[PDB]
Design a binder for these strands. Structure first.
Ligand code: MG
Lengths: 47, 322, 48, 29, 58, 71, 141, 222, 35, 291, 48
RNA sequence: CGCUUCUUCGGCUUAGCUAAGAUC
């Protein structure tokens, strides 16, 4: 039973904290494809 | 399965419009002359059954009317709403003679007991409450369920009160003792609707997984009426054995009670200027003959359905196919 | 009442009429100044 | 585009019709 | 973080207020509308198209 | 959490030793030769000042934690 | 760039009886967290686990029993309630917990697996057979 | 006095403020800056600073639409602007620049490019939001270091008044608490509104009867 | 200019069914469901 | 009097005594919903119904925490309706979106229908609460703009509502008029026009007078007063700017809009940028003098 | 499981967590609606 | 045939409403 538990437990700057850091990674995961057409206009220096 | 009894198709024949919010409740007067209808415009409208003409609009709820029952034995209409009010409307004066206060959140449904002067009401507070119709006293609080109680229905014999809930249970209640003497756990999701068969000792209940039939008084499971995979929030049972189950997506399946065969699948159309998201059915009732089905809609209309007079078995055949 | 006069006057027609009575630089200033972003609270649109 | 630039400068920056004077000529675009 | 200004994500429940579960738990202070009223019950007249007679009335 | 140096018969703070690092010091002991004064910090830490240095900017010239204390 | 992230964001990247009294403070924390917010089932697991960690097995049991009154359909609570008993070698308690779990939620495979596995690891293999037999009586997946 | 010419420090403070407070609470943004109003910060964003405002070179289909629309929609530069997909200031100064090319081409187009229209006369711009900012100077001064320090501060000062004030009671007491506990450690209040949960098991739900005798389990306390 | 934005095909089913718009009451509030 | 007050005080003193001896049981009595509490109660029961639809709609086997995110999408979908922003979430499941859209339209319908009802109260005089009037003006301001944005978009989509026939008819009609009137068209203000400083001073006093009638001033009003004072101190600089604007700009800062609440009917009010008002006000003065 | 992924609601107006920005992406709440509206051809007939 | 270090893959959890609540 200690084995089951123990294996269960082994799991730019744009955040104020680690909670916003995990939130930002969800923004990346869930808007990744949906913003590629925008990101190019973000990367090109606003040209 | 076993042999369906044949039932005629139903066709749309009237669309009454005039509510400005979702029509949440419908009930038919015992003499079949008229039906009431509450809606999210906080107004109860009384309509003539044969001609559809709006007799009267009764205003007095603070917010959405979403239960409405006409008493079988009294000149009273009972209604409850999201404002926690339950109101007795004296139809001999068109005025609110009594209030029943104790609900802590929105009244979801109410049912008026067929032979006692007793009213039962559901709310989001996870209770059904039983009211003395006369003195407004709360004779029982049925604190069994663990999530909002979506439907209630009353009958003269035990269980005098049956209740459905968002905890996915149906409960049968001893109205004398005020304790649930059975719990029917078979639904996977919220049980939003109930109906008792008007001439069989049997009742049905709907949830998005399945409609289930149940032999009373023990409530033992008979059969699923499977395949209507939508948030079913009304059930109406005809005197001859049709049952119908309108759903939140606006589809409207009709079933033979005896076999469970789904003989028709209407899809309702939103009336002009409403979005396709507003197709939903929020309530339905049969008229007392059992030949006009009245449905109350998320598009703010009241639609009425009628058996197709010219259909016959050889025009719309049923085989056997077990 | 000549209802909705100011709501309905077309700025291109107005400009051509203003071109008659006054110097075109003024008439172009006047009609361009009618053609500007309206704002209330969080709501924005161009007056066209 | 210079053809239509020259064309519309004859349409825009003219003095008013109520003054008379000869029309500026335009070009076929 | 702000959290006191939260909605009802949690379910509402009840059935344990004054006079619920035991009739002696009503306090002797009672509300103004709890007075006796409309105590003669009305009933629908005889021959109101009652269900069985209505059924006969095809 | 400031150290104020005061003169006899004088109510005002002639020299103030103040830095963000100051804390409550429950015990202070001075050497009999006046060469050193010792101060104890509640998290089991010691910070030293020299009686002739007057290092009013605050300092940790010599510090020790070899004692097994915990308060 | 000048400032827009590598400074303006980066510059905010950073900026004895005393044990007995600690127990009393923790129960004050847990029990009022419960009073404030039942259905936060993780608080009930943490509270029940914590009483086990302090050796208060009888307290820990009652806490899980009170958790099950709030949500008896939570597979996590039944498993964490079961696992803490078999961590503590309370095999007859653990057996009773599993018999209740499989009685109340017969369709949850996790109880049947964990129960029959426990009864196998503990070398009561005719006990394990009867658990599998009782499972097959539900005509499972 | 308000506005003035824009400085590159201000644009990046604005970018940081916009990418925190959100694209439509400009007053909360403008209180981070000096000199600018909310209306000027808002204007600065949409009129020039916003990404996607198409500051690439113009091209002959843009010029065709610009000259086409300038005939259909004379002076309507806010309605022309969506249709060419460019800011109204870009549309207008392009149109004026294209007329400047077309007008110098009347005759002496080489010197007529140069002897007047080569630059504006140095008058104050009626809306320098439409223009690129002044680059920041070779070293900072009080007018910029102050707002930069205040900007850096506010950008993560997310604690409210209540949290900022009363959480200090931890640090101001806990040292003294351990010191007052140090009296307990070295010299050696009633509560009754509630059950003491450590006295007896609170609201004890007893484990139901089951088929296995629980008393066969012997546990040793930790 | 005011006129309409919305479909007729639903009104084509309105050839087969009694479509009603009913913003007024056929009896006054004092007409009391004849006692 | 005592005949009827006797049972009233018998009840009241009973209630007084009973809570004085029994204590006040009234925890968990049902609070009823009243004037101010309606609008928060609508949001309770909306979000509860939405949440119930979410949990029933999602299939068995989904992490329920997604539901609290859906309630955020609802709140954004409402604000976008309120602010007439088009709302579209690209990855949102279509049953979830279609569910949200229905509730936004129910909130919408209730929100506008209560604006209409409250305004009939304000017209009839059945309400004397300044907060209700100030609330309702906000709603009606949005409902106006929500339809005005439609009207401005429809114009570009539907094209000129006036035919080219009608437009040349009215154009030629004014030419034939103004020709027969011998109307000499108004020139651009000459560089050394004799009357300019008088027309300017007339323009400035029309602007300055709007601040004598007010006890308080704010940053936009202050900047206007600075411009008026600057124009008084150096009018040849002010006139130089004013004339340069009419020659050399055609893109103007955004115009704020507001409504003025005469209880029978709202009047639209606009605030032009102060640097531009001084130019329009001179031009207004110039046009009317010349005409 | 993929059919019932709900994107996080990145908002314009408000966010209590107080930052809600990725430097890689944030501009998204306004969508990608159809630019450069089809101006009706009747404007050409009227103007000319 | 077994143990350990390390990276690496799926998972990795914004506390309502009101006239943006109001104002600069
Ligand atoms: Mg504050």
């Amino acid at each position: 039973v200690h084995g089951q538990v123990k294996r269960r437990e082994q799991y730019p700057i744009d955040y104020i904290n680690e909670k916003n850091k995990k939130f930002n990674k969800k923004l990346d995961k869930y808007y990744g494809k949906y913003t590629e057409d925008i990101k190019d206009d973000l990367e090109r220096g606003t040209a | 399965m076993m042999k369906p009894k044949w039932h005629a198709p139903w066709k749309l024949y009237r669309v009454a419009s005039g509510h400005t919010g979702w029509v949440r409740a419908v009930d038919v007067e015992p003499g079949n002359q008229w039906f009431a209808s509450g809606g999210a415009d906080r107004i109860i409208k009384i309509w003539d059954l044969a001609s559809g003409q709006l007799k009267l609009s009764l205003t007095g709820h603070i917010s959405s009317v979403r239960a409405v029952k006409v008493s079988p034995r009294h000149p009273f209409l009972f209604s409850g709403g999201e404002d926690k009010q339950v109101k007795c409307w004296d139809l001999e004066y068109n005025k609110v003679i009594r209030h029943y206060h104790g609900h802590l959140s929105a009244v979801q449904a109410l049912s008026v007991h067929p032979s006692l002067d007793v009213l039962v009401t559901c709310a989001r507070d996870s209770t059904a409450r039983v009211w003395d119709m006369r003195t407004k006293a709360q004779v029982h609080c049925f604190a069994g369920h663990t999530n909002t109680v979506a439907d209630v229905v009353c009958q003269s014999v035990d269980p005098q009160v049956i209740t459905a809930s968002h905890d996915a249970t149906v409960r049968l209640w001893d109205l004398a003792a005020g304790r649930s003497m059975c719990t029917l756990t078979h639904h996977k999701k919220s049980v939003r609707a109930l109906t008792i068969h008007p001439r069989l000792n049997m009742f049905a209940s709907a949830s998005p997984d399945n409609i289930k039939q149940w032999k009373l008084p023990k409530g033992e499971f008979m059969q699923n009426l499977s395949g209507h995979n939508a948030i079913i929030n009304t059930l109406s049972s005809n005197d001859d054995g049709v049952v119908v189950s309108g759903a939140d997506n606006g589809s409207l399946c009709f079933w033979d009670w005896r076999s469970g065969f789904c003989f028709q699948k209407i899809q309702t159309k939103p009336q002009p200027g409403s979005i396709e998201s507003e197709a939903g059915i929020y309530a339905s009732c049969f008229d007392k003959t059992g030949l006009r089905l009245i449905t109350a809609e998320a598009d703010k209309t009241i639609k009425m359905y009628k058996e197709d007079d010219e259909a016959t078995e050889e025009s719309h055949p049923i085989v056997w196919r077990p | 009442k000549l209802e909705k006069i100011a709501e309905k006057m077309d700025l291109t027609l107005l400009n051509r009429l203003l071109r008659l009575i006054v110097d075109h630089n003024i008439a172009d200033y006047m009609t361009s100044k009618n053609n500007v972003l309206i704002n209330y609270k969080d709501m924005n649109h161009t007056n066209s | 585009v210079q053809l239509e630039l020259e064309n519309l400068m004859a349409l825009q920056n003219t003095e008013s019709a109520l003054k008379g004077g000869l029309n500026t000529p335009l070009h076929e675009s | 973080m702000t959290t006191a200004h939260r909605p009802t994500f949690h379910p509402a429940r009840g059935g344990t207020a004054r006079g619920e579960g035991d009739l002696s738990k009503l306090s002797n202070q009672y509300s103004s509308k709890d007075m006796p009223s409309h105590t003669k019950m009305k009933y629908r007249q005889t021959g109101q198209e009652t269900e069985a007679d209505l059924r006969k009335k095809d | 959490k400031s150290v104020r140096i005061w003169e006899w018969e004088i109510p005002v703070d002639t020299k103030l030793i103040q830095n963000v690092g100051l804390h409550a010091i429950p015990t202070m002991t001075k050497s009999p030769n006046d060469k050193w004064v010792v101060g104890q910090c509640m998290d089991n830490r010691i910070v030293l000042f020299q009686l002739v240095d007057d290092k009013l900017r605050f300092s940790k010239k010599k510090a020790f934690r070899g004692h097994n204390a915990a308060g | 760039q000048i400032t827009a992230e590598q400074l303006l964001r980066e510059a905010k990247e950073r900026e004895p009886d005393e044990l007995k009294e600690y127990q009393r403070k923790k129960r004050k924390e847990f029990e009022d967290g419960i009073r404030k917010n039942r259905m936060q089932l993780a608080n009930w697991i943490k509270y029940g686990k914590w009483e086990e960690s302090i050796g208060e097995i009888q307290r820990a049991r009652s806490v899980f029993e009170r958790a099950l009154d709030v949500d008896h359909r939570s597979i996590s609570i039944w498993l964490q309630y079961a696992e803490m008993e078999m961590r503590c070698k309370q095999i007859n308690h653990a057996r009773n917990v599993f018999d209740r779990a499989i009685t109340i939620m017969p369709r949850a495979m996790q109880f049947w697996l964990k129960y029959s596995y426990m009864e196998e690891v503990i070398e009561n293999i005719p006990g394990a057979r009867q658990i599998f037999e009782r499972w097959i009586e539900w005509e499972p997946p | 006095i308000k506005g003035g010419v824009w400085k590159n420090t201000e644009d990046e403070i604005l970018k940081a403020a916009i990418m925190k407070y959100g694209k439509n609470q400009w007053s909360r943004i403008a209180s981070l800056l000096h000199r600018k109003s909310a209306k000027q910060c808002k204007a600065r964003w949409f009129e020039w600073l916003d990404p996607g405002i198409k500051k690439t070179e113009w091209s002959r289909e843009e010029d065709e639409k610009l000259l086409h629309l300038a005939k259909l929609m004379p002076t309507q530069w806010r309605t022309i602007a969506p249709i060419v997909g460019r800011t109204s200031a870009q549309c207008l100064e392009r149109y004026e620049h294209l007329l400047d090319e077309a007008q110098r081409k009347a005759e002496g187009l080489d010197e007529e490019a140069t002897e007047t229209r080569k630059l504006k006369p140095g008058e104050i711009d009626p809306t320098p939001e439409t223009k690129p900012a002044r680059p920041d100077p070779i070293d900072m001064d009080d007018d910029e270091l102050e707002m930069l320090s205040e900007a850096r501060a506010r950008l993560a000062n997310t604690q409210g008044k209540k949290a900022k004030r009363k959480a200090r009671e931890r640090q101001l007491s806990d040292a003294r608490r351990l010191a007052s506990l140090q009296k307990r450690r070295e010299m050696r209040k009633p509560k009754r509104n509630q059950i003491d949960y450590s006295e007896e098991i609170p609201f004890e739900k007893h484990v139901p009867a089951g088929f296995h005798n629980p008393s066969e389990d012997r546990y040793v306390v930790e | 200019e005011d006129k309409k934005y919305y479909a007729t095909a639903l009104e084509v089913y309105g050839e087969g069914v009694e479509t009603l718009v009913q913003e007024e009451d056929a009896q006054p509030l004092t007409e009391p469901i004849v006692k | 009097f005592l005949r009827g007050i006797t049972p009233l005080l018998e009840r009241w003193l009973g209630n007084l005594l009973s809570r004085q001896f029994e204590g006040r049981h009234s925890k968990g009595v049902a609070k009823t919903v009243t004037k101010q509490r309606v609008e928060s109660h609508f949001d309770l029961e909306l979000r509860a119904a939405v949440m119930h639809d979410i949990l029933d709609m999602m299939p068995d086997g989904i992490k329920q925490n997604k539901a609290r995110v859906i309630l955020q999408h609802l709140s954004e979908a409402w604000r976008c309706w309120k602010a007439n922003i088009p709302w579209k979430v690209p990855g949102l499941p279509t049953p979830v979106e279609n569910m949200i859209l229905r509730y936004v339209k129910a909130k919408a319908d209730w929100w506008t229908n209560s604006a209409h009802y409250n305004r009939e109260r304000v017209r009839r005089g059945a309400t004397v609460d300044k907060t209700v009037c100030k609330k309702n003006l906000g709603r009606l301001t949005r409902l106006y703009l929500k339809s005005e944005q439609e009207r401005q978009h429809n114009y570009l989509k539907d094209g000129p509502y006036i035919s080219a026939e009608e437009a040349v008819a009215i154009y030629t009609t004014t030419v034939h008029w103004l020709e027969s009137r011998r109307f000499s068209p108004i020139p651009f203000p000459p560089l050394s026009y004799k009357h300019d400083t008088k027309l300017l001073i007339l323009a400035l006093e029309r602007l300055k007078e709007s601040y004598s009638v007010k006890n308080r001033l704010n940053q936009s009003q202050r900047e206007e007063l600075a411009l008026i004072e600057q124009a008084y101190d150096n009018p040849h600089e002010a006139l130089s700017r004013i004339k340069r604007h009419m020659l050399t700009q055609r893109a103007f800062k955004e115009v704020g809009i507001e409504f003025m609440d005469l209880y029978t009917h709202l009047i639209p009010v606009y605030d032009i940028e102060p640097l531009e008002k001084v130019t329009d006000a001179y031009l207004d003065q110039y046009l009317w003098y010349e005409a | 499981q993929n059919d019932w992924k709900i994107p996080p609601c990145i908002s314009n107006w408000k966010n209590p967590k107080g930052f809600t920005v990725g430097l890689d992406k944030r501009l998204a709440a306004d969508g990608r609606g159809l630019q450069q509206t089809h101006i009706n051809e009747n404007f050409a007939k009227l103007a000319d």
